[PDB]
Amino acid sequence: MHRTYSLRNSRAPTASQLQNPPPPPSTTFGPELSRKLSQLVKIEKNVLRSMELTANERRDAAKQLSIWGLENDDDVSDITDKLGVLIYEVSELDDQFIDRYDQYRLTLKSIRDIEGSVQPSRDRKDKITDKIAYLKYKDPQSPKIEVLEQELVRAEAESLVAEAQLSNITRSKLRAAFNYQFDSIIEHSEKIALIAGYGKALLELLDDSPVTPGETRPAYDGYEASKQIIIDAESALNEWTLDSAQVKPT
Amino acid sequence: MHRTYSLRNSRAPTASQLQNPPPPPSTTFGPELSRKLSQLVKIEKNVLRSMELTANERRDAAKQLSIWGLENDDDVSDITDKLGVLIYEVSELDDQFIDRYDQYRLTLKSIRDIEGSVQPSRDRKDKITDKIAYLKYKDPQSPKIEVLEQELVRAEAESLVAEAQLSNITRSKLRAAFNYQFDSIIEHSEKIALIAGYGKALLELLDDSPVTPGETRPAYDGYEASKQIIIDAESALNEWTLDSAQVKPT
Amino acid sequence: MHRTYSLRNSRAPTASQLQNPPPPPSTTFGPELSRKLSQLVKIEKNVLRSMELTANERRDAAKQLSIWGLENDDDVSDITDKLGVLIYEVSELDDQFIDRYDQYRLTLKSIRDIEGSVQPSRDRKDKITDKIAYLKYKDPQSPKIEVLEQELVRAEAESLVAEAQLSNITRSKLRAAFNYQFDSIIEHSEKIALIAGYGKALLELLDDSPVTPGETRPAYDGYEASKQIIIDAESALNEWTLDSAQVKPT
């Protein structure tokens, strides 16, 4: 982030910022082992709910735009409806992305559960060690020291296997979960970019030449290109695959 | 110090003073054995707190400089921020030096404790000697004199071993503590000197040619050398080792 | 600083940290134009006072160390005194560094004063512009508009010369002040490093071989090397020059 080599929150200028000045800002108990990882889940759930609300509101706006667009000139009354139809797809994409996000959250919850179950063995080994130390302090001639040592050896073996078992699966699950999340993000971004790029061509057939008072506009006949654009967008959405990613990292 | 061969507090001129005249001055109970060594610890702690306050204030000044530097010409608004970022490292170095100073203070406290524990044996031997002397004065025919002499011999043996044991470890701990402190001082000074030397090159790319009223300055493009200087400084700081000391005593 | 590529305050390991684990943490109105630059001066003054207190406390500790060192073995009673004498030079160096810091602070105060004096012209030009705008709004037929425009042109010329005059000197003073401060820092660090390096050799002639109870140590005769080390340190301090800097940036 821009504060990498700066002490202030101001963003460093870039090529896009140099080309166009930036717009002004907008006017608007539990186990000890599993405690930091058990907090991330709540934040992810909150993100999911907020994103669902955003998608619902965007769908409502897309629905409402065509209602206003109904009572206007013939070309506007069609372009507005088609643009609303095109915008309606963003919520559909957002729903699938939310589902994949929930899958990733469950994958993380699995690791949380396994480490929370692992903790008690390392608790009990320390308890046994404290007990034998206290017994040795109080009176070295007690007979409980031998059995304490034997069960300490047993618990030490169990704890030795437990830590290796936990560390064998933590990274294995983490890598898969993050790869899945990154693939989902890439797919969502590429689909949104494709939708926007295809929708940008809808405005090319909307005339914008100024007219003087007392003149009549020519009849608008663009009911075919508008249908073709939507059909092509649907075909492109149904055709896209992960192996056909246009964005290539350098 | 300059008063070595003088009776006044005035400093003798040197080569640096000959080259440049000196600026004017700025306009702004307990055991008896462990009593002198138990006072040095408090002074060291006071030094530590004062140095921590100095580092905090310097960090605050470095933070505040860029805020003023924000509203100026393009080159100044960048050089000021980079210089503040570079100055921010001095507090980070000071924190580590403070930690090493505390380690040295603890090492000295160990010697204080051991000598304070040693003292009572040499107290009790003198007490026994005074008692036997008084008993011999009062009446030489008392039977307590023999047992007093026997326990005096025992205490004499114990005190003989105690003094040797104390003197065996006092120098051993003192030498190690002072070597550690000197190494810490050398490392801190070398790192500060390296930071200052690398930061002195930041001002070479800041233009200083005078301009007349009614003229416009050329566009400033120095966003690459400024980043390179910071990257090189970070690399040099992460690369420095004790064995690579540039300063060599004669 | 280590948070450059991290989101946490933990310091990234380095070569020195890899070689030796880090010790644990220690157990212990005004013109609008000149307002951000008029705050840095107070922070610099606070830094100066805190550094003066640190130097005073360090001098006190160096004075107190020899008092404890007086009552010990012959070699320790001399090494401690010589080490205190050597440590006494750090406060002397700190005083000169404080003086140079005050010089730099005065240099910055000059810029603060000049910009504070510059501000009123740009205030009065805006006031005149607001007045003529209001007069034009209220009644365009007023005769004051012409004289307002004439004096607006005059004030515009004055303000045009003023901004160029201020910007011609701001960078010129800033660069010189920061170069002076960096040179002072480099000199102070190099002198401290030289003092520490020369003082590290004082402990080589202090014997540390352990002794058993009932034995006597050999007579210590090191009153010549101790004097020679101090004489060499004084000569090196009086000989050092800025052009003879041992530290060379890469």
PDB file of N, CA, C and O in Angstrom, chain C residues 13 17-18 27 30 42 89 92 106 123 133 136 177 186 202 209 215 225 238 243:
ATOM      1  N   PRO C  13      13.732 -10.651  11.424  1.00  0.00           N
ATOM      2  CA  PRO C  13      15.090 -11.075  11.782  1.00  0.00           C
ATOM      3  C   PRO C  13      16.116 -10.603  10.764  1.00  0.00           C
ATOM      4  O   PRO C  13      15.835 -10.477   9.570  1.00  0.00           O
ATOM      5  N   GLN C  17      20.554 -10.524  14.257  1.00  0.00           N
ATOM      6  CA  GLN C  17      19.563 -11.264  15.030  1.00  0.00           C
ATOM      7  C   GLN C  17      19.703 -12.768  14.828  1.00  0.00           C
ATOM      8  O   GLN C  17      19.471 -13.541  15.764  1.00  0.00           O
ATOM      9  N   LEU C  18      20.062 -13.201  13.618  1.00  0.00           N
ATOM     10  CA  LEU C  18      20.301 -14.621  13.387  1.00  0.00           C
ATOM     11  C   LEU C  18      21.520 -15.108  14.161  1.00  0.00           C
ATOM     12  O   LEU C  18      21.502 -16.206  14.730  1.00  0.00           O
ATOM     13  N   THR C  27      12.811  -3.898  31.265  1.00  0.00           N
ATOM     14  CA  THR C  27      11.831  -3.911  32.343  1.00  0.00           C
ATOM     15  C   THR C  27      11.371  -2.518  32.750  1.00  0.00           C
ATOM     16  O   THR C  27      10.445  -2.403  33.561  1.00  0.00           O
ATOM     17  N   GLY C  30      -1.578  32.932  16.037  1.00  0.00           N
ATOM     18  CA  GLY C  30      -0.433  32.852  15.164  1.00  0.00           C
ATOM     19  C   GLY C  30      -0.824  32.838  13.701  1.00  0.00           C
ATOM     20  O   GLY C  30      -1.938  32.449  13.336  1.00  0.00           O
ATOM     21  N   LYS C  42       9.513  23.370  18.866  1.00  0.00           N
ATOM     22  CA  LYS C  42       9.291  22.952  20.246  1.00  0.00           C
ATOM     23  C   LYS C  42       9.751  21.516  20.469  1.00  0.00           C
ATOM     24  O   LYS C  42      10.359  21.201  21.500  1.00  0.00           O
ATOM     25  N   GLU C  89      34.257  11.103  28.517  1.00  0.00           N
ATOM     26  CA  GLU C  89      34.337  11.867  27.275  1.00  0.00           C
ATOM     27  C   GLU C  89      33.021  11.907  26.505  1.00  0.00           C
ATOM     28  O   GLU C  89      32.833  12.797  25.659  1.00  0.00           O
ATOM     29  N   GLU C  92      31.156  15.081  27.096  1.00  0.00           N
ATOM     30  CA  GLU C  92      31.815  16.186  26.410  1.00  0.00           C
ATOM     31  C   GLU C  92      31.445  16.212  24.933  1.00  0.00           C
ATOM     32  O   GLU C  92      31.189  17.281  24.368  1.00  0.00           O
ATOM     33  N   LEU C 106      17.980  26.914  14.998  1.00  0.00           N
ATOM     34  CA  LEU C 106      17.896  28.329  14.639  1.00  0.00           C
ATOM     35  C   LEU C 106      17.762  28.507  13.130  1.00  0.00           C
ATOM     36  O   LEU C 106      16.997  29.365  12.654  1.00  0.00           O
ATOM     37  N   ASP C 123      -2.959  37.162   2.272  1.00  0.00           N
ATOM     38  CA  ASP C 123      -4.234  37.405   2.947  1.00  0.00           C
ATOM     39  C   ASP C 123      -4.943  38.625   2.357  1.00  0.00           C
ATOM     40  O   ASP C 123      -6.139  38.575   2.026  1.00  0.00           O
ATOM     41  N   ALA C 133     -15.619  41.568  -5.583  1.00  0.00           N
ATOM     42  CA  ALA C 133     -16.710  40.687  -5.992  1.00  0.00           C
ATOM     43  C   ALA C 133     -18.029  41.107  -5.353  1.00  0.00           C
ATOM     44  O   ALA C 133     -19.067  41.172  -6.029  1.00  0.00           O
ATOM     45  N   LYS C 136     -19.289  44.324  -6.986  1.00  0.00           N
ATOM     46  CA  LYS C 136     -19.862  44.048  -8.299  1.00  0.00           C
ATOM     47  C   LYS C 136     -21.242  43.419  -8.173  1.00  0.00           C
ATOM     48  O   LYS C 136     -22.141  43.715  -8.968  1.00  0.00           O
ATOM     49  N   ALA C 177      20.838  23.445   6.094  1.00  0.00           N
ATOM     50  CA  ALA C 177      20.593  23.031   7.472  1.00  0.00           C
ATOM     51  C   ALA C 177      20.700  21.519   7.616  1.00  0.00           C
ATOM     52  O   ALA C 177      21.339  21.012   8.550  1.00  0.00           O
ATOM     53  N   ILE C 186      27.337  12.468  11.776  1.00  0.00           N
ATOM     54  CA  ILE C 186      28.409  11.569  11.353  1.00  0.00           C
ATOM     55  C   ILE C 186      29.631  11.743  12.247  1.00  0.00           C
ATOM     56  O   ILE C 186      30.239  10.762  12.697  1.00  0.00           O
ATOM     57  N   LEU C 202      41.296  -1.775  26.925  1.00  0.00           N
ATOM     58  CA  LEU C 202      41.660  -1.626  28.329  1.00  0.00           C
ATOM     59  C   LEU C 202      41.432  -2.900  29.129  1.00  0.00           C
ATOM     60  O   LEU C 202      42.095  -3.101  30.151  1.00  0.00           O
ATOM     61  N   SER C 209      42.087 -15.175  35.245  1.00  0.00           N
ATOM     62  CA  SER C 209      42.283 -16.580  35.580  1.00  0.00           C
ATOM     63  C   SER C 209      41.709 -16.873  36.961  1.00  0.00           C
ATOM     64  O   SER C 209      41.964 -16.117  37.906  1.00  0.00           O
ATOM     65  N   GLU C 215      45.430 -19.273  48.074  1.00  0.00           N
ATOM     66  CA  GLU C 215      46.487 -18.866  47.164  1.00  0.00           C
ATOM     67  C   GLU C 215      46.528 -17.347  47.058  1.00  0.00           C
ATOM     68  O   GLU C 215      45.529 -16.659  47.282  1.00  0.00           O
ATOM     69  N   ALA C 225      50.739   0.495  30.380  1.00  0.00           N
ATOM     70  CA  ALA C 225      49.820   0.287  29.266  1.00  0.00           C
ATOM     71  C   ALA C 225      48.529   1.068  29.467  1.00  0.00           C
ATOM     72  O   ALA C 225      47.953   1.591  28.505  1.00  0.00           O
ATOM     73  N   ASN C 238      42.152  14.181  19.245  1.00  0.00           N
ATOM     74  CA  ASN C 238      42.643  15.473  18.780  1.00  0.00           C
ATOM     75  C   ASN C 238      43.078  15.441  17.320  1.00  0.00           C
ATOM     76  O   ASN C 238      43.254  16.505  16.717  1.00  0.00           O
ATOM     77  N   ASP C 243      37.463  14.890   6.912  1.00  0.00           N
ATOM     78  CA  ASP C 243      37.948  14.265   5.688  1.00  0.00           C
ATOM     79  C   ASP C 243      38.519  12.872   5.919  1.00  0.00           C
ATOM     80  O   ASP C 243      38.709  12.132   4.948  1.00  0.00           O
TER      81      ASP C 243
END
